[PDB]
């Protein structure tokens, strides 16, 4: 059980329930709004403000992080799928509660 | 012929709108149905949310 696995499943966990929010604005739109009380960043873009303003936001509003490696990867397990690609992720909910979901909390 | 309205592409657009502590430049919208998460938009004179057309001059 694997902290790859656990996000992996509780993503897919939250596409299934509609509770994902998916891009930097709808990101930072969650994250402002006081919800979501997730998020998961991915090291692999290369933009240094988009990292910059994600960590600076989800600190400010004290919430869980988690730096994944490649932005394709994410967007293929966000559900983006031919994959766009996504570098930002936030959880506005999970849909049930399960054994990822306890595995990420752990490792928070 | 009448040529189409085409959409002017912003990259990164959110990106504009903070400034990293942290720093909301531009103002919020006062709206129940907005809220914080909504930027309001800077015009030469003045402020307009798009979402629900709130328009406050200068
Ligand atoms: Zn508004």
């Known amino acids: 059980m694997d902290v790859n696995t656990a996000l992996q499943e ?6 299934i ?44 509003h004290q919430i869980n992080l988690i730096k994944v490696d490649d932005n394709k990867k ?5 559900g983006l799928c031919k994959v766009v690609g996504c570098s930002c992720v936030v959880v506005k909910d999970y849909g049930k509660e399960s054994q990822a979901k306890d595995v990420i909390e752990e490792y928070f | 012929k009448k040529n189409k309205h085409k959409r002017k592409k912003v990259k990164l657009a959110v990106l504009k709108y903070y400034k990293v502590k942290i720093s909301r430049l531009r103002r919020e919208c006062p709206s129940d ?12 004179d003045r402020h307009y949310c798009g979402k629900c057309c709130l328009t406050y001059c200068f």
């Open chain 1, 10 to 15: 509780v993503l897919k966990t939250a596409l």
């Open chain 1, 17 to 60: 329930h509609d509770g994902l929010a998916r891009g930097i604005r709808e990101a930072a739109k969650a994250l402002d709004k006081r919800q979501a009380h997730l998020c998961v960043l991915a090291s692999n873009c290369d933009e240094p403000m988009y990292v910059k303003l994600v960590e600076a936001l989800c600190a400010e």
């Open chain 1, 74 to 78: 994410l967007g293929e397990w966000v």
């Open chain 2, 33 to 44: 149905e907005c809220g914080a998460g909504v930027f309001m938009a800077s015009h030469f």
